[PDB]
Structure 1
Amino acid sequence: PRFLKVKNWETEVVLTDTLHLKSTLETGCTEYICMGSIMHPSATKDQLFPLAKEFIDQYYSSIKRFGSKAHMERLEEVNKEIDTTSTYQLKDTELIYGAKHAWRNASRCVGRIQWSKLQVFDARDCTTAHGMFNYICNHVKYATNKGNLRSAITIFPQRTDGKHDFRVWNSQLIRYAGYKQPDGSTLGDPANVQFTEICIQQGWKPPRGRFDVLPLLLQANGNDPELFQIPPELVLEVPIRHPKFEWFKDLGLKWYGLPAVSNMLLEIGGLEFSACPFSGWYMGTEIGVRDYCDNSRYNILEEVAKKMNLDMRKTSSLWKDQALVEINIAVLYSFQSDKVTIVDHHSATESFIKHMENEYRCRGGCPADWVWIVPPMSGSITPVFHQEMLNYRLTPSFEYQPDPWNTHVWK
Structure 2
Amino acid sequence: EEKEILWNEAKAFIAACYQELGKAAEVKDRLADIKSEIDLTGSYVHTKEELEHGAKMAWRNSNRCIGRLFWNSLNVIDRRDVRTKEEVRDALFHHIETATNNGKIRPTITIFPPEEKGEKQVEIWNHQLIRYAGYESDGERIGDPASCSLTAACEELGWRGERTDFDLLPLIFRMKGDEQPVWYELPRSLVIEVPITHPDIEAFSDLELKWYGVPIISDMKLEVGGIHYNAAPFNGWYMGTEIGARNLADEKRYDKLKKVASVIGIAADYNTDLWKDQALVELNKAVLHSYKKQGVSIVDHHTAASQFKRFEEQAEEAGRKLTGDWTWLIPPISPAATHIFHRSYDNSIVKPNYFYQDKPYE
What TM-score bracket applies, with the shorter chain setting the length? over 0.9
Which one of the candidate residues 27, 33, 48 is aligned to 1:71? 27
Larger helix share, 1 or 2: 2
In structure 1, the partner of 2:332 is: 376
In structure 1, the partner of 2:36 is: 80
Which one of the candidate residues 44, 50, 57 is aligned to 2:15? 57
Distance 1:93 1:170 in 2: 28
Q: Between Structure 1 and Structure 2, how many residues are aligned? A: 361
In 1, are the aligned partners of 2:198 and 2:285 still within 8 Å (CA)? yes
CA-CA distance at 1:158 after TM superposition: 0.5
In 2, are the aligned partners of 1:129 and 1:225 still within 8 Å (CA)? no
Distance 1:278 1:300 in 2: 28
In structure 1, the partner of 2:301 is: 345
In structure 2, the partner of 1:226 is: 182
Q: Which moved more, 1:395-404 or 1:44-53?
A: 44-53
The percentage of counterpart residues that share the same residue type is 43
The yes-or-no answer on 1:217 pairing with 2:175 is no
TM-score by length of 2: 0.97
In structure 2, the partner of 1:8 is: none
1:30-84 CA distances to partner (integer Å, 9 max, x unpaired)? xxxxxxxxxxxxx722321111111111122112232x2x322211110000001
Q: Which consecutive segments of 4 or more residues in structure 1 shift more than 3 A?
A: none
Which stretches in structure 2 are left out of the alignment for 5+ residues? none
The yes-or-no answer on 1:389 pairing with 2:345 is yes
Q: Look up the equivalent residue of 1:378 and give its one-letter code.
A: S
Q: Look up the equivalent residue of 1:161 and give its one-letter code.
A: K
Which one of the candidate residues 302, 310, 315 is aligned to 1:354? 310
Which one of the candidate residues 273, 278, 292 is aligned to 1:322? 278
Distance 1:114 1:353 in 2: 12
In 2, are the aligned partners of 1:181 and 1:187 still within 8 Å (CA)? no
In 2, are the aligned partners of 1:236 and 1:258 still within 8 Å (CA)? yes
Distance 1:222 1:329 in 2: 48
In 2, are the aligned partners of 1:127 and 1:221 still within 8 Å (CA)? no
Which stretches in structure 1 are left out of the alignment for 5+ residues? 1-42, 407-411
Correspondences of 1:192-341 after superposition (within 5 Å): 192-221=147-176, 223=178, 224-341=180-297
1:275-310 CA distances to partner (integer Å, 9 max, x unpaired)? 010001000000000100111100000111122332
1:95-139 CA distances to partner (integer Å, 9 max, x unpaired)? 001000000000100000010011101111111222111111111
In structure 1, the partner of 2:62 is: 106
Distance 2:216 2:105 in 1: 11
CA-CA distance at 1:319 after TM superposition: 0.7
In 2, are the aligned partners of 1:163 and 1:222 still within 8 Å (CA)? no
Give SS of 2:76's match.
Answer: strand
Give SS of 1:217's match.
Answer: strand
Give SS of 1:404's match.
Answer: coil
Distance 2:264 2:297 in 1: 28
Distance 1:164 1:370 in 2: 33
Distance 1:389 1:280 in 2: 23
CA-CA distance at 1:254 after TM superposition: 0.6
CA RMSD of aligned residues (A): 1.2
TM-score by length of 1: 0.86
CA-CA distance at 1:225 after TM superposition: 1.0
Distance 1:192 1:364 in 2: 38
Distance 1:344 1:57 in 2: 37
CA-CA distance at 1:222 after TM superposition: 5.2
Distance 1:285 1:261 in 2: 17
